[PDB]
Amino acid sequence: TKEVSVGARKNAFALLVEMGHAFLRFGSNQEEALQCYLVLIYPGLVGAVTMVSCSILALTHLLFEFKGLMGTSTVEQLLENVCLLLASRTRDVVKSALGFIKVAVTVMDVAHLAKHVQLVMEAIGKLSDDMRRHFRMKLRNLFTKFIRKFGFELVKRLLPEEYHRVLVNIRKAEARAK
RNA sequence: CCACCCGAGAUUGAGCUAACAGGUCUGUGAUGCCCUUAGAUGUCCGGGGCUGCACGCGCGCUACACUGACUGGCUCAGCG
């Protein structure tokens, strides 16, 4: 899934989906089988940095396919770990964490996300100057999705100063898109 | 646009709060002066005025009639 070839990456993603399907046939309860599947891939978030980004990308692809079936609270736990991985120096780990956060915001229910806007968006807030400037597109899209899904004034209140303008800039599009 | 083969590579990495004269609009100075039983129209009450009329400068209404005025019938609309 982090190979050089795009075809190999596509095949590895499809193979992950297929083995996730394969563990849905070895037991009676699907959720516990998916839990066993994840605890077979959980240690990869601990080893090498490229292996950490590998595991974050794998979890990102897995979260989009088996959205609710793995179990919401467990989702939240993984998101919390991604927040620690939001503190990484490497740009690949940060990019993979941003993609996972985007996929989670797309997938996860808004009522349970409301418990976790502050933590993940605080982890977004204290990222860096270089990290903010480089991945300004991903942060822009994430703040757009948070404004769609929650109160604009809430994200305004809990973010630091500079991001404020980015928020209102997004809100600016929210009048001309209509 | 999607998928696939070959190919090492069919996209992996680096760089790219500010400006608005596009509009709007009552926040910051231990801000300069002038006034503060000389109330930057002090509240209230009662009664007057706003219309008062020699004359100028001008819009309007009614008329000076006979192609008119008075008296009785007739049949006619449209915006709203």
Side-chain angles (χ1 to χ4, degrees):
Chain A
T1 58
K2 255 301 196 184
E3 209 68 29
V4 188
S5 195
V6 64
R9 280 169 266 151
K10 289 178 182 180
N11 297 331
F13 283 139
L15 181 50
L16 279 173
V17 170
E18 198 62 38
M19 64 183 73
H21 279 341
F23 285 170
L24 289 184
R25 305 183 313 242
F26 297 166
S28 65
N29 196 21
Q30 275 185 1
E31 190 162 305
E32 296 292 327
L34 292 176
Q35 284 314 119
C36 182
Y37 184 50
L38 288 184
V39 302
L40 288 180
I41 75 173
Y42 282 165
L45 284 84
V46 181
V49 177
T50 184
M51 187 66 204
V52 161
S53 187
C54 275
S55 284
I56 298 163
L57 281 180
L59 277 173
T60 309
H61 191 76
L62 260 63
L63 196 76
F64 186 56
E65 283 272 347
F66 308 126
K67 314 180 184 66
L69 278 81
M70 183 277 287
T72 54
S73 178
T74 65
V75 176
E76 290 168 337
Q77 209 158 355
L78 274 186
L79 193 61
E80 189 266 331
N81 270 328
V82 161
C83 292
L84 303 193
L85 300 160
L86 211 49
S88 172
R89 287 310 106 75
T90 318
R91 271 193 207 198
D92 197 1
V93 182
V94 174
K95 182 181 178 195
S96 299
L98 289 182
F100 187 86
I101 287 174
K102 176 198 187 296
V103 162
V105 165
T106 297
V107 164
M108 187 66 204
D109 272 357
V110 290
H112 299 86
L113 276 167
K115 193 192 138 192
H116 291 282
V117 176
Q118 184 197 332
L119 192 149
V120 312
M121 182 277 288
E122 174 202 342
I124 286 182
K126 46 177 288 296
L127 198 65
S128 283
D129 171 53
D130 199 354
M131 281 335 297
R132 167 195 179 241
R133 185 170 295 276
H134 167 57
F135 289 128
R136 69 169 66 185
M137 284 73 74
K138 295 206 183 322
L139 267 68
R140 156 193 294 277
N141 188 22
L142 280 179
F143 295 154
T144 300
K145 280 180 154 48
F146 269 112
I147 281 164
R148 295 283 74 78
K149 275 185 158 39
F150 299 92
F152 167 79
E153 314 95 347
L154 170 63
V155 179
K156 172 164 276 266
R157 191 190 79 239
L158 303 160
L159 269 176
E161 201 74 10
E162 313 92 3
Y163 295 103
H164 274 131
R165 284 197 71 252
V166 184
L167 300 178
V168 311
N169 278 265
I170 293 164
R171 192 264 305 277
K172 285 168 201 193
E174 295 188 358
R176 186 171 289 179
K178 303 313 278 167

